[PDB]
Ligand binder design. Structure first.
Ligand code: HEM
Ligand code: HEM
Ligand SMILES: Cc1cc(N)nc(C[C@@H]2CNC[C@@H]2OCCN[C@@H]2C[C@H]2c2cccc(Cl)c2)c1
Ligand SMILES: Cc1cc(N)nc(C[C@@H]2CNC[C@@H]2OCCN[C@@H]2C[C@H]2c2cccc(Cl)c2)c1
Ligand SMILES: C[C@H](O)[C@H](O)[C@H]1CNc2nc(N)[nH]c(=O)c2N1
Ligand SMILES: C[C@H](O)[C@H](O)[C@H]1CNc2nc(N)[nH]c(=O)c2N1
Ligand SMILES: [Zn+2]
Lengths: 409, 411
């Protein structure tokens, strides 16, 4: 229970002590590692230890641990739980909880930024229409005309769990997908289902390739409702290449704001089932994953053809060649249009710096190597050579299943 | 208990029951995953269970579980253990054991090949000179003039742990590394320490960028002895690029035969501390790791320079550009000289078909994702998208510390 991590490129060894404060289960056992499995109410009794654990860490953070003000809040929260079966966070607590859920997100390479997070408190929200208003304000604030700013917006916490707030979308901004008589897929094959659910709720799809999807918002356990985000709030980037004049003709674009909206924020045992958050893209996610995944826009073959490469044998590395050029183009387009983006070299470098800060100041940094190492050029980024320990700390973000599977109408 | 893995590209779901046969520990717990941590004598007492488990597996494999042959062999081994504290494997058991250790090796993408392995039984070897000869024969057989054949050579097992056979080299063929007084390195920085031991053991080093190291071989717990592999036996490939004609003048070459020599093979509780084995390269190992790791030959800068790439910002992806070209060159060069090599697209596709076949016939296939996914172009290979379960089956290969840290010098 005192663990070393070694970087094999630099020989730097760091000692992890933070893992001992870890609480939740990993999915791994002594006999089986589940490191690469993507997926490996609360009663009164369960809630007070959770609240106490959180308030202790909070009061510790502001150097008032064991102070009258610490004990008094523990007292206040205990009474409120006993009498109301739940409790409410102070603004200061909510801000701290959200920043720490990000600090603890072991799959997140950009956490050097964790303390610069603008938190929008949407706990007074009561309808879908209000949710939409909050989300547009989030979008406009975060986008900031291309100078992106990290933000989260936090809707009301769970109660009896039959009144959840949820954003049905997996991200605030994504593109539609429709399956055609042709048998192929137009637009984003990842969202075919969600797009069907939208149309059957009433969306009129402009039956195209890069149709920004409508929001489906569920306030207070109600049936969700549709809203189109103002087109003028969705900053999109046309994709061109600095050297390939034909590239623009693929007709590719992507949206500037990555904004995850399906997670559950847990703070001091309280559960925030709608907490859309956003930062800015690492270029590989668009160029490697969205564009080149087989099940996504799947554009390797068309780009390779346009480059006039040898597609007859895997060993000519035509896929690898086209992959790099696609990613040069994503970075180039975002940079030309002055929209914040980070390349994988720069993002992984800052993360190693972040890991070292966290090791000296905090005793560790939970990190999931399988997600942290970029989907291309892994071993030429410093994170490939860095041992990481993965463990679960709270406050946390947790993945929740798609609500259409669940919800009753 | 059943455990499922998903492929996120295909939605193919597989069910693992084989993990139930797993003995050793992973390093992970309910509270911590050590999946990216590189490193996470027996008594009679622990030995007969291990022997029994093994022979039961062997006898099942051949469809004679519970036969008189099976029961006779159990009795025979038990008696040998109580009487001598160890036991000897029959040839058939050794072969089966060394194949299964490969089969079980969760970090190996090449395992579709597992049933095709040449086993050289070197258990009669007694001296380092005898080890050299065995290793020469292995290299010649495996190389096969570029038509590479997988092989393993198995030296006598551990006895009291004071009489170990070991190959001090980490692979049979690697290049020397010389650390210069200015702090630069000539040749391979990975082999600096070992090169320095060779030299101290009396090696006359040529001091160039690609000097094949001498074998340093330890027999029967004795101090290791130096041998030069006959150069005519060391197949090498000069590295050139199909389109860039300046690439040859970087002066690069690599050896054709990757041959891991530092691992410990465990079969049925017995420990084979010298068991060099070899297959053939996947190109990325040379082109990504050996050439492009910063702590190795580190050629990215020189290549990208010659390619006239924009090097002022990482966002030009100049490193990634130079990386692909170097890997094209490695594959082209090997193919042009008719030396077996597999590209990472081909090897991963084959591995997925192997893993799937194993789930159907064996009830699973332990795989270490962190190692199986190639160190370039990860997500455009099918393995990236494949959930894997990592666990430890015997027979097995295990890492062992370098012997210069443990050896009792006899002088
Ligand atoms: C500011 C720039 C940021 C960068 C460059 C960044 C980078 C990334 C990347 C590349 C991923 C992988 C996503 C994927 O592969 O789908 C990720 C995952 C994640 N990040 Fe960040 N991040 C940023 C901001 C944020 C913020 C503001 C939060 C929360 C407050 C956050 C929390 C998370 C979480 C919880 C995941 C895992 C998502 C999942 O399980 O689907 N990140 N991060
Ligand atoms: C036949 C062609 C083969 C190919 C293409 C192949 C591919 C690979 C690759 C790329 C690695 C990772 C190497 C590294 O990163 O250092 C590996 C690891 C490994 N393979 Fe293979 N392999 C082959 C044959 C074999 C054979 C013949 C054996 C033993 C009989 C073997 C057992 C292992 C073991 C134990 C590891 C883990 C090595 C370690 O921990 O350092 N492989 N395989
Ligand atoms: C089954 C499953 C589990 C989990 N935990 N996540 C997913 C979502 C799956 C997992 N990686 C792909 C897909 O995510 C796409 C969304 N990417 C984030 C937008 C990008 C991003 C980038 C930078 C900053 C931020 Cl805030 C967000 C699926
Ligand atoms: C600390 C440590 C632990 C372990 N388990 N292995 C290592 C050796 C580390 C692990 N990746 C780098 C270094 O290996 C270089 C040798 N690679 C084998 C040549 C390649 C190979 C390729 C194809 C077929 C075969 Cl039989 C063998 C180091
Ligand atoms: C099975 C495997 O865990 C899965 O493909 C993972 C691999 N690593 C990843 N890494 C990131 N950042 N995002 C992902 O979606 C994935 N997918
Ligand atoms: C820290 C990390 O586990 C380490 O760098 C690993 C990652 N994956 C690897 N994969 C292979 N094939 N070989 C390696 O040496 C490594 N090194
Ligand atoms: Zn694990």
């Amino acid at each position: 229970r005192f663990l070393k991590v070694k970087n094999w490129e630099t020989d730097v060894v760091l000692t992890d002590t933070l893992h001992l404060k870890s609480t939740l289960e990993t999915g791994c056992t002594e006999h089986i590692c589940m490191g690469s499995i993507m997926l490996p109410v609360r009663t009164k009794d369960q809630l007070f230890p959770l609240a106490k654990e959180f308030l202790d860490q909070y009061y510790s953070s502001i150097k008032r641990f064991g102070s009258k003000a610490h004990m008094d809040r523990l007292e206040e929260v205990n009474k409120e739980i006993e009498s109301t079966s739940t409790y409410q966070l102070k603004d200061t607590e909510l801000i701290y909880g959200a920043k720490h859920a990000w600090r603890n997100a072991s799959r997140c390479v950009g956490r050097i930024q964790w303390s610069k997070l603008q938190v929008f408190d949407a706990r007074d929200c009561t309808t879908a229409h209000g949710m939409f208003n909050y989300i547009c304000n989030h979008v406009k604030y975060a986008t900031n005309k291309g100078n992106l700013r990290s933000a989260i917006t936090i809707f009301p916490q769970r109660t009896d769990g039959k009144h959840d707030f949820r954003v049905w979308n997996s991200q605030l901004i994504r593109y539609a997908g429709y399956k055609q008589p042709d048998g192929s897929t137009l637009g984003d094959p990842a969202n075919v289902q969600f797009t069907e659910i939208c149309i059957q709720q009433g969306w009129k799809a402009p039956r195209g390739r890069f149709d920004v999807l409508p929001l489906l918002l569920q306030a207070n356990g109600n049936d969700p409702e549709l809203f189109q985000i103002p087109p003028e709030l969705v900053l999109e980037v046309p994709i061109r290449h600095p050297k390939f004049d034909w590239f623009k003709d693929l007709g590719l674009k992507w949206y500037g704001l990555p904004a995850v909206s399906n997670m559950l924020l847990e703070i001091g045992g309280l559960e925030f089932s709608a907490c859309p958050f956003s930062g800015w893209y690492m270029g590989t996610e668009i160029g490697v994953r969205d564009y080149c995944d087989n099940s996504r826009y799947n554009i390797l073959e068309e780009v390779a053809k346009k480059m006039d490469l040898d597609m007859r044998k895997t060993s000519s590395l035509w896929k690898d060649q086209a992959l790099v050029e696609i990613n040069i183009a994503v970075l180039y387009s975002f940079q030309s249009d002055k929209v914040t983006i980070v390349d994988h070299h720069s993002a992984t470098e800052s993360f190693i710096k972040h890991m070292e800060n966290e090791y000296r100041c905090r005793g560790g940094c939970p990190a999931d190597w399988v997600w942290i190492v970029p989907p291309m050029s892994g071993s030429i980024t410093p994170v490939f050579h860095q041992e990481m320990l993965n463990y679960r700390l709270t406050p946390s973000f947790e993945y929740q299943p798609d609500p259409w599977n669940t919800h009753v109408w």
